[PDB]
Structures are given as C-alpha cells and as structure tokens.
Amino acid sequence: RRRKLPATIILRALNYTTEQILDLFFEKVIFEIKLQMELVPERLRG
Amino acid sequence: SQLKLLVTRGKEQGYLTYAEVNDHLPEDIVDSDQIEDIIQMINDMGIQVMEEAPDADDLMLAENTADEDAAEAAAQVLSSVESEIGRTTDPVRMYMREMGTVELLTREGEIDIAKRIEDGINQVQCSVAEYPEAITYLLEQYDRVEAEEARLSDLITGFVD
Amino acid sequence: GNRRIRSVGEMAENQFRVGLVRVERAVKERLSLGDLDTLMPQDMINAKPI
Amino acid sequence: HARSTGSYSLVTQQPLGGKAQFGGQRFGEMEVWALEAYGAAYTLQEMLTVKSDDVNGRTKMYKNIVDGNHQMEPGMPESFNVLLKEIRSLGINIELEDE
Amino acid sequence: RVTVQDAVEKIGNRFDLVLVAARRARQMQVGGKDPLVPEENDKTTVIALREIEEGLINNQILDVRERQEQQE
Amino acid sequence: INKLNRISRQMLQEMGREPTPEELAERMLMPEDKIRKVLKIAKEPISMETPIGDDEDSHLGDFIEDTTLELPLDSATTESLRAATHDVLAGLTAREAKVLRMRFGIDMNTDYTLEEVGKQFDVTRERIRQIEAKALRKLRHPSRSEVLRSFLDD
Amino acid sequence: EFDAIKIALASPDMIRSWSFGEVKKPETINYRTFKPERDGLFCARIFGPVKDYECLCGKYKRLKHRGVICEKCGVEVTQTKVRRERMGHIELASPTAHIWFLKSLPSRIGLLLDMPLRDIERVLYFESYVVIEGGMTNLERQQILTEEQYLDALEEFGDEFDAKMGAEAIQALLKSMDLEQECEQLREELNETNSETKRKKLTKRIKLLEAFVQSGNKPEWMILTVLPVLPPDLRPLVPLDGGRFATSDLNDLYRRVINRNNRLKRLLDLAAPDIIVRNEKRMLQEAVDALLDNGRRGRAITGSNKRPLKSLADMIKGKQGRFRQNLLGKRVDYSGRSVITVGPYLRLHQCGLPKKMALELFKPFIYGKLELRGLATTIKAAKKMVEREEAVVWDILDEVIREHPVLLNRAPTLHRLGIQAFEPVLIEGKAIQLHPLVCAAYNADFDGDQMAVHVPLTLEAQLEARALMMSTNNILSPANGEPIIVPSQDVVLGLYYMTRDCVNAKGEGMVLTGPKEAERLYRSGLASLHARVKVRITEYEKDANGELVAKTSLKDTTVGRAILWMIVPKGLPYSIVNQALGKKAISKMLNTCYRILGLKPTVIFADQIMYTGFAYAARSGASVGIDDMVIPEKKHEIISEAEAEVAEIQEQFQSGLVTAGERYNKVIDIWAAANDRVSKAMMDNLQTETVINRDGQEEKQVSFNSIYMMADSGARGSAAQIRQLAGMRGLMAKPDGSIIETPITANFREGLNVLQYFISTHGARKGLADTALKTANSGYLTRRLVDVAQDLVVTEDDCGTHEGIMMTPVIEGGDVKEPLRDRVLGRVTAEDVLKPGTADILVPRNTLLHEQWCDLLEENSVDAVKVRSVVSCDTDFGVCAHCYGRDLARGHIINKGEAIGVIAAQSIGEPGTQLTMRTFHIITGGLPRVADLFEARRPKEPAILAEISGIVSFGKETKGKRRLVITPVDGSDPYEEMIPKWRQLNVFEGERVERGDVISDGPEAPHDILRLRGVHAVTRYIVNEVQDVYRLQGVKINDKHIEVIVRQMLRKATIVNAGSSDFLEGEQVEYSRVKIANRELEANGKVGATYSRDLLGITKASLATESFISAASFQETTRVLTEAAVAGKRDELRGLKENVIVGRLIPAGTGYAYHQDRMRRRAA
Amino acid sequence: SDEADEAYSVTEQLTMTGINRIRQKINAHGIPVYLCEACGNPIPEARRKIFPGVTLCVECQAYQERQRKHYA
C-alpha cells in the first residue's frame, strides 16, 4: 500500500529487459521486405 | 505542486483514499509522524482521508465542514511542510537528537572530568576558608556540639584522617 | 471460494502459538545467561503467560 | 418497568439506567424536538430539570407533590453545572452575568 | 374534558389558554379558592378549563380579581 | 508484592495448580493475614469510561450509583418528622418545651448542655435533668405520641 | 437569574481566584485507609469534606460545628457536595502554551503574533531562540535565531540582545505586544495597501486585533501559568466491589502534569544542565496538552489499556460528551415502559395503564392522598400501605389518576405525534393498551413494540398535556392537514364489507322506513347486509349561514349503507356512505366531516367508525383460505407462449442474428411481458364472480373473494402481492440491480422449488439489509434540518409586507399534477384577487384562504393567486402569523409563539422516511437527493445564465472557452464570460437577451438563480424540485415547510455598497441585522447600504448561529469555544437549544410569555 | 411495519427499476434505417425484423458491447 511504481519496474527487478518483456506480453506482428505484411487472419477481426 | 495537486484533487473528489495520499505525499519523508500530521491537516481541510472509496450516497449525505479560515491555515501549513524534512513532534526524538549531538567520554576523560570537579570544589574550599568568620562560626558549631547541642559526628563527618 | 472457516481448534491453536513465542523469548534469554547446571526445564517456563 | 423516584447516578446525578437498576426512561433529543413542536415549555423544563438532573429541585418537587402543591421551582441542571466547571477547568472563564 | 376547542375560542390562543388555566387552577388548588363553576369531582385543571369555557375566567378577569383582593 | 509474585510464580509451577494463601504464608515467612491483605490490595483500578458495552454505548460510569443522597422519600419523612416534633412540643408547657428544644438541638445550632441550660433556668443541672425527664415522660404517653410512634421504623 | 452567559480568557490571577488551594502532591487516597491525601488531587482542605458536616480525621462531628475549620487536618466541616464545586489550581513551574490557542487551525497565538505556526512551535519545543525586543542592534523582532546562530550573534554583542526560547519566549512576545498600536499601523497600511492579498490579510488581521481589544482579554493569557483543577466529584475515584476502584482518565492526566511539574521544580532547584531542563519543560508541555486536549499533538497517550485517555475537550465534545447526551438526552424519573396491546374499546383520549405501573409512577401523589384523607397517619404509614397494596390504595389510585394525562412515546420520535397525552384507564396485566387509530401516528404495530409513559408533574404540564398534546387535539398531520386518524385494516374491511352490495341477497327491494328499520331487519336476520333496498333518509345540510336545514328523501342503498348512516353526524351528505367505502373513501369521509363540522364531531365520528368497523368485520367472518388464491387457467398457456418466444430468440442468437446482451434484453422483456399477462389474467379472474338473480339469469358482480376483498377494500394488500400469491412471481433482481433472467414461473399457492427459492433470496436479503440500515440513521434529515430551523419562531401577528409568491398549478407537461386550490389552501393572500371580469375583488387581502375561499377561487377559475410566503416576511428574528399561514396541525391560523421551524424540520423529515433510502434515477429520487437539494450543492454542469441584460455578443475564439460579452442597450458591458464551447449555446450572437436568462443548458445552480432573479425565484425552484421528489414517491408535504427551511437557508447578506452605514464591503452579515441597520441609517439623515443576497446549504447556514452555547452543540465544541473566548462573546440566551441546555423555558411554546415579561423587565 | 414489509418495498423498487431499464434499452418502435451507422453495411433483414429500429449490425453492436462492458 506504498507509493505507486510502474508495473514493469518489477519485471526489470526480476532481471528482464524490454525485448523480453514485450516477448512475454505481446504478439509480434512481423512485417517483411515492398513493405509486405505477414498475416494471421484471426487478428484482423475488425 | 504535488501535495497541492493532491489537495485540489481531494477537494474536487470530496474524499481521499490512503493510496492516493501515499502517491501524492512527498518521498523525502521517512517517519510516520509527519505523514500523520499531513493526514490530520488534510482531513481538517477537510477532505476525510479514507481507506476505501465512499459510496455515491455517502458523498451527498456526508456533511461538509468547515470552510474556510481553517482551509487557508491548513493549506499554508501543507504548502510549507514539504520543504523542511527534519521536522518532528515527539519529545523523545528531539531528546535523542540533542543528546546524540554530544560526543561520548572515555576512561581517562572521566578521570580528567572528576579531577576538574575536584579542582573546582577545592578552589571553592580555599576561597571560603580564606573567610575568617567562616572558621569562627565553625568553631562555634563545634563548641555548641561540645555542649551536646549536636553530635561530635553530626556537625561534621570527621576530618581527612 | 475466497473465504475459509476457522473453528475452536484453529483459533485456539493460534493463541497457543502466540503463547509459545512469548515463551521462546524468555527461554532464549535465560539460556543466554549462565546456562549453569542445576538449572532445569521447570524454572525457565512459568505457565502464566502461555 | 416503571419508576417514580429511585436511584441516582454518582457522577452525573441522573436517574439510573435500566430495569435492574430500577432506572428511568431516556428522554432524548428527538423527544425534546417533539416537545418543542408543541408548546410544552413546562413539560420540557421539568423533564430536563426536576425529573432528571436538578438535584435540589427534584427533592422539592417530591415534597410538594406529597404536599398536594403541583408547582416546581426548577433551579438549574447538574449537567450544566458540570459543564461550566469543566469549561472553567480549561483555560476558559465562563460565567453567568447579573440577572 | 376531551377537546378544549371552546376554551381556546374564548381566549383566542393555545399557549395563553394553558397559562390562564394553569394560574387559575393554582389559585383553586393551592392558594385556595372556590370554583366559579360546579365541579363534578374534577381536578383543578378541568375545572379551570371549563370555567374558561363559560367566560367566567380569563386573564383580564383574573388580574381584576387580584386588584379586588388587594383592595381587601 | 514483587516477592509475593516471585514466590507464587515459582510455587504454582513446582506445586501443581496454584498456591493457596496458606501455602504462600507457609512458604514465605509471613503471618498469613499480612499475605491476605497484600493480596487484597487493589491494582490499577479502571477507566470509568470503559465500555459496558454495545447496548447503548454507555461507559461504565453510568451504572455506579450515588449512595450519599437522601432520597426524596427520605427527605419527605425527615421534614414530616420535623413538623410532627414541633406540633408535639406545642402540647408541652413553656419550661418543658424550651428545655426539650434546647437540651436536644431543635431550631438552634446545638446541643446545649445541662449546666448551660440550667444557667438560663438557674438550676444546678439536677432540676434541669428532672424537667427534661418529666417532659420526656409526658410525651411518652399514648394519645400524645401516636404519630411520633408511627415515625418509629421497625 | 443570569439572563446571559459571558465567556473570556481566564487570567492566572483569576484562576487563583477560583481556586481553594494549590494541589502539590500527585497522590489520590491512602491505599490502606482510603482517606484523601493532604495535597493530592482528592484533598479535604482544597476540595472540602468527605462526609457531611464532619471533618477528615473526625475531631468535629457535629452540624453545630458548621463552617468552622478543623485544626488537626484543616478540613472545614461543611456538606460534601461542596467537594463537587471547588476548584484547585496547579502552580506551573514553567509557562505552557494553551493547546487550543496554538494547535487550532487559525492559531490565535500565531495569527495574533503575525507569526507562522511552525515557527512558534519551533520556539516552543525549544528548537530556536526568538528575538524579543532586541534593542536597536539590527535584530528583528520575532526573527528566529538558531542555537549556534544565537551564540555567534551573542558574540560581539555582550549587550542585552534580548533573545529567548520556549513558552516564556511566546509569553514575552505577547506581553510586550501593543494591540491598539498594531491596529493603528494596520489601519495606516490598509490605507495604502490596495492589493488583494496584502490589504485582504491586513483587514483580516485588524479584525482580530480590534476584537482582542474589545473582549478585555490580554494577549498573554493564552500562555498558562496557573492550571485549574477540576473538583474531585467531577472525576471520582470510587470503589467498586471487592476492594476494586474505578477512576476517571482525568486523574491520570492530572497526575502526569503534577509529577512532571514537581520534577521540573526539582530540576531547577538542583541546577541541572540545559538539555535536562529543556527536556523536562517539553515533557510538561506535552503533559498539559494531553490533559487539556489529548490527541492534538500525537499521539493520544493511552492508559492501562490500548485506548487513549479521555480529557477535558473529550469530556465536553463527542456523543459521549456533555452536550450530546447529557445536556439534552437525559434519564427521567416518574416514567416507565411496557409492551403495548390493542385495547380496542378505549376512546381516542385514553390509554390502558397497568395498575402496577400506575401505582409506581403516581407514588408521591398517592402518598399525599393517603395522608390528606387520614388513611395514613404519616408518609411512612402511607408508604407501608401502598407497599402492602391494601384496599384503599386502589380507590386512591382511581381518584388520583382521574384527570391526569400520561405521555405515551415510542422510540423513533420522527415527529411530534410520537408523543401524546392520554388519560389513563387502569387495567389489569402489565401491557399498555394503545388505541387503534393512534398507531399511524406512533408507527406502532402490536407485534411486540414497547411504549414509554411519562407523568406530567406540574399543573402547567398537566394543562400542556390536556390543552396541547392530548390525542383528541392532534388528528391532522402537521406536514399536511389531512387527518391522521384514518382507520387501518379491520376497520376498513368492516366498512367495506357492510357498504358493498350484491345482486340478490335476502330482502331485495324492500322499502325500509329508515336506518333504524334496516338495522332491526338485519339483526333479526330477515335481510342481508348488502341487499339493495329503497330507504328513507333524512340528511341535514348546513346550506345557509350555518342553519342546518333538514331534507328527507328515498335513496337506493344497501342495508349496510343505511345501518352505517346511523353513525354519521348531521352536516354530512348521504353520498358519503352510498358507495363501497374502501380506504380512501373513509379517509375522505373523516376529512369532509372535519371541514364541515370541526373537531368534536370528528373525534366522535372516528370512534364510532372504529367501533362499527370492528363489529361488522367480526360479523363479516372474513377468513382466508387456500381456495381463495384462484390461479388463472390461462397461466400455463401464457407461459408456453413466452417460453416459445425465448427459445426462438435463443435460436436466432445462436445463428449470429443478435448479440449476447441484445438477446438478454429481449428475453428479460419477454418475461416481463408474460408476467404482465399472467397478472392481468389472474386479476380479471379474481375481481368478478357470477351470481343469480331476481329473474333467474346469471349476472356478473364484483367478487366477494376474501383475498381480493382485502386487496380491493384498501384494507391490506394490493394486486402486486396478489400476483405473487396466485399469478407468477416474475423476474428477480440481484443486489447489484441486475435482473436474473430465469423467472419464477411459480406462485405461493403453488410452491417454489429449491432453485427458485434460492433465486428469490437475493432480492430478499438485499431489501432486508437495506431496511435494517435505514433503520439505523432513520432520523438524520430531521436532525440536520432542526439544526438550522430551530431558533425560528412565530413571533409577530402581521408584518405588513406586500411581497408574496404567485401560487399557481403545476402542469407537468400534460395535465396538472397538483391544482391551485391544493397549493394555496391555508395561505394568506398578499393582494386583491380580481374576478376574471378584472374588476371584482374576489378575495380582498389577508384573507385566510379556507375551503370556502378556496372553492370560490376555483369556481371563478382564478388560477394565479399571490400568497404571502415565510421567505418574504419582513419580520426580524422571527416570522409573523400572516406570512406563515394556517397551522395544518390545527385547522385555525398559527398562534403567535408557535415554534414553526422545528415543526418544519420534522414535517420534512418524518415524511421523508417513507421515501427510498437510496437515490434511484429514472429525475432522481430518494432521500439522499432531498438532502443534497437542501445542501444547495453546485451541480457540476451548470446551465449558464445571462448575468447582465443587453445585446448578445461574442469575443475571442477558444481560449479554452469561447468568450462572450453582453452589452446593455445603453449601459456598460464590463461582464464577459468564458463560455465553454462544450457548453453548446442556445442563442445566436444576434438576439439581444434579457438579464437572467439561459446561455447553455443543464442543471441550474440555485446560487445563480437567486443572484439573477428574485428570492422568489430561488424559493420556487427549491420547493418545486424537492416536491418533485416527494411526489415521485407519492408523499404529500406542504410547501410552507420547505419555504421556512429555505428562509433559514438564505439568511446571509453580502454588502456591495456600504453606504453611510458601518459595514465593511466584502463582508457577509446576518441579513436580519443589515436590514434593520440600513433601515435605521435611512431613518436618520443617511442612506442605507445595498447588499447582494446570499444562499447557504443547511449544514453551512446552521454553522452560523448568533449564540455559542447552542453552536457548541452541533459543531466542533473546540473551535467554537476558542473563537468565543478570544472574542469575549456573550450569549444573551434568546434561543431554543440554549435555554434547553441551561435549563429554563424555551421561548417557543408556553415560554413565549415568560420571555416577553422578562424582556419587559430587562428593558425597564 | 414488521421490518419485512419495508424490505418488500425496497425489493419491489429494485426489481422494477431494473426491469424497466432493461426494457427501455429495447426501443422496439423505430425507424427503418436499413444500413449500419458504423460501417454502412446492410443490416440483414432478419435483424431489422427482430429489432425494428436497429442502428448497428451485429458485429458493431457486439464490439460496442465489449467496450461498454468495461466502461467509458
């Protein structure tokens, strides 16, 4: 019940980096090359 | 600004949880006495620092008092409290502070202080003993002792013998 | 599923553990001083604060 | 439970509370508003003075009632006397002016 | 006595009526007097209120009788 | 008291349940009455603001009564007896009435004594004693003291 | 005897003037003998003897030794109630700043020294020296120096330099202070400090300086040097059982002060160093602080417990304090409670008192009777007689009780009808027997409630009960003049069953000779109670100057209609009983009887109605069976159709045709609609039945079903509970307010299975949990309102003002929801009401609009009458009887004296208890909305008004808000507004708008309505809103009561032009004062000061009371008392709450004459 | 009062206010819009026959329902 810190401060305190955090919490929409997009059709629900 | 934001956000919200106060109170403060005084003043404001959010009806029903001279006094205390950090209210903390200001003694130092007290009292001894009516009245005391108006050990505790 | 029940057994066991920590204080300190022989496990534990 | 006149509490000289103490009835704030909403100025003055807290007027009321003279000389409640002394025991000097 | 409407009408106030009846009933009870109305084994309260009904009693009459008493 | 606590804290453990005061006075050297009064010495009495509680949020002080009051029935009886004594002394001669009012303490702040009474009657306290006795015997009669009899409580 | 209370700061010398001796030792009693000590807090020399007329040790044991001071213990022989009166004092070895004048928010010491609070606290707890008149040496008066700094500044300055630290420093700062001189310098700066914060605080400080001058206080008295000691019997150390003692917390705090003060004297005598003596002084400071107000320092010192000790400030404040529940709420003698029962034979003026309660309460009266009649020789003999309960104590009880009312009171006294005087009728048993028609006033059912009876003791209180509170005087609700004697459930069912015809009963179409013959026919059983007969009825109509002409005719009525006509008094028409007579029919019957005939015939009529209702309801034989819940046969058809509809909607949802929440809404709607069809079908099955007949053919008449007869007579129940009994139960809520979409297709004539009985539990427990907590704070609105409207009293007969609000109908879009005759009845007209011909004065003026004038008004169709309002009364410190109206608790006009403010508070609070406890939004409702209304809070989205009149014009574009200016047709336009473009406007820049008109849309803040338009505008706004709520739930409460509460609301004025008067400009003043002030100043050759009327929410207006004994009740006692002390205020009592506290008559009721005569004396 | 009769009134108000809120959200009588106000798509015939007066197709409706589920 102390002062509020950013939640990912503790994910860094557990010895993660930003690439690892974003690997944990997100999915990587991968674009390739022009300017082509790999597609997971389920993503674009609308 | 920070605690000012807290005060204004409370006064528009009508309440304050402990969490919001913790987020808004400064970070220099380490003790809980300044924090509880801040909570007391801010409740006097008054905004009624709570633990949980009040119900919608508890805002309408809760009587609001009491502006606004105490409002100004409370705000002028809270705007200044954030600056001085060492502020304290316990007499025990003040005592421990002003006692820690002194530096401890050592064994030979205690010998020095004892001998210096002995020198001071000895100088007092000599100054008094250079007063003749002093020894006259002392002989009179011992005489009225010898008349058994006192004890041969009561008037004085013997000599340096 | 978030709330569980205590009863006499568990509440009384908790109180007895509180008494036991109070005992541990005195027993540690008394085994700190002297530890001399003829000191037995009857003089170190008085039943009142448990 | 009922009571004409019985036991009286030590610090605050009111009739005791409860049936085990043979106590009186709590005439509270809302009953006082109800009495003020009528005109019962005397009803209230005696519920607050003679039937409750005025140690010297309760005995005179009793003597009068057995004398068959229904009149009260109410004096002043012991609750207000204790209040005056307790304000005076702070640094405030509170007092009752010339009549 | 059930409703005091006539006693109230004679005096034209509901607190002053209480006061007039109370002082006349105190005269009739403690100070000692004779009911101006035939008391049918009523307390001094009801006697005073009934008297105020018949017009026999009011504040003017009572102060006038106090004057006459002094002239005694 | 510290010694009593020490010896009890030891004896209860070594002896079983608890030391009865005879057992403490035996283990100690005290006379077992001193021990009992030491036990009876009260301890740190209480805040009279203590809750009772939850019935009305009335602290403890509400139930401690004032036992020094003359209850209004008692004062009524007192003043009734006062008026009755007056109306009885009315049925006495002036000498008897004065000597009984003054020998007792009625309507004066005493409690006069026999020599000081007989000063005002010029008696050397013997005739004054006799006059008091005669008045008391006269008031002793029934049909003169039936009310005063009723004032007796038994 | 005093006529006024004064207050001030107590001088050290005056604190020794009170004292009877200086307490020195900390001890209390002996621990062995328990005797008081020689200088302890419980002394005998200081605080007097322990037994009456008997010194401490015991040398002097006679009352003849009175007043003499013993020699061996010095204890003067007096009464030991003297020990409850005598103060002592404590000679402080160091000055100790009084915590109220330091740690209070403005900090009178701080704002008086013109010094910051932290700086004084640094000088006080021995942080930093302060310069106290440091000569010419470049030293700054009140300039803090620190320790090292004080040393080095003393370096090079062997000269005085006059610097001190500690409470002595503040005492030498205050003592040296010149108050008038600082007032002079502050006036001279206020001359030329014409900037807001500077001259603002200049004036705000010169106010307190001038006040400290006037009050006689010296500035340095706020630094205690002597400390008074509460007397021993106000803080006892009494023994409990078994050597046990119980003390006050005050003794602990006092001992702490005495110990530390004695140790400080020791330290000073022992020449200890600076650290030790400083720390001892800090300790004494904290001890004295905790003694006065424990908790303002932190932390509250705890006793032999975890909880703080209670202190003086605690001994006064808090609900455990003196003001809360020892100055108003007191335990009372000659009183007692029991359990109430019915006693349906009594009259409206009596109550069955048990013989045992009656013999206990009336004890002194009985003793007096036995010794008066000679049945008991002395009071002891009478005591023994009535203790044995002999045979003549009972005759004496009958005689004593004969005309001697008893007040019956039930616990939640929401209004003044929770107290009524009844004549005792002695009964056996131990239950109080309470009249049936009085339960509505008392809110009392006979399932175990209890009542408290009190006994009026004086002739004046006997006449106040008889004349004023007797149960046959109070029959109209004081909130609205409708009679409060409406018969409830067996009565109305009796009158409904008897007054309710059927098509073919015994003896149809006989022509009776009259009601006597109809009753003789029914009681011999020749005719049935509802058998339509021609009956000859003689009704008497006062159609005259009160003449009562008789008229006989031949009506068509049932036999019960005519049997009941025998009880109705003369003036009432015959159509009053010729219909079914449900519940409202009976209430309207009593009401028309009251409007025609008055109070005596109405009381008689009410009793006869109760008697006949109970009698013919018992003869009704109206039981309740299981076959009386006629479940309709078309219930399972309707449920099959609804189930098919939900199955179809679920099939469509499964096919993606709808969403999830959409289909939820659809199915909730389907189930609500099928529930409506089932309820309608069952009530149409239940509300009619077939019957035969004169000629022989079946004929439909209203059903004599018993459950329906009870729901339809209004006696008890309604078609919703009927629906739950035989129709289906429906959809059920959750505590959140969501609706479980699995309905209860069962009823209670059938059963619920385990799942439906579980589902119903949700809403059931929610409702009960709310009703259990609403019961806790049942009377908070009433209390809040009586805080502000308490001192308002009807003090004048006519103010003469011609101001008055224009009462008109409320047309809620369609028709009227409240006509003009209802809103205007009882009010005094302010001007002449002209006929629609516009030349005929219909009702002239000052005409109490009773039902005759009101009918005349509705007849001519005059639909806007200017009536006098309590809010527009020109009276000072009160209201007149004309601007108020009639009483509504008594049919007549208000009396001079009546305390209408408390009546208004209770008349708004008690009816509010029938409103929802939580606000619901549809126009919100519930009690919390009403409380927020009276608190006059600002709505967040204020529809902005037009502050000045003139041509509309805009300005700069989007400085946050779009800017506008209004510029008069001929005047200046210094007012412009930062209108938010979010506030989407309503009028173009090319339409000249009048002043006080809408710019944006949304809720109108009442402050702006009041400031733009008349006070009448704000008052009409407030009454229309709050009555919107009260009509939302169906509750009726008059507008007079809201109007008086509002007049208590807008009772402050703000002065614009101070004129030739003596008022500061930006100041708020009691408007009733500034009115008389400008009136007087305009009387002489001056001109008055013009002000802007204000408005305060009730919790804000009640905080501004002219007195301080009253204001220390419902406020913070500490701030109010500190302010009154530094102001030297005096309370010339002149109030209700203050005279309650101080123990004399209030100026409201019968006390009005006492206060008038007393004001005569005080002005002579 | 009985303490369950007032509870009955509370429960009645609670259920009725809930029922009528969820009824008002239906808006059965309406306008034939024929095309989505979010994506302009053809609101299919069956959805306009079920709910006369829709403004969103089922996709945009369910989308909006998610957001209004959380809040804001």
Ligand SMILES: [Mg+2]
């Ligand atoms: Mg009940």
Ligand SMILES: [Zn+2]
């Ligand atoms: Zn003595």
Ligand SMILES: [Zn+2]
């Ligand atoms: Zn007026």
Ligand SMILES: [Zn+2]
């Ligand atoms: Zn769409």
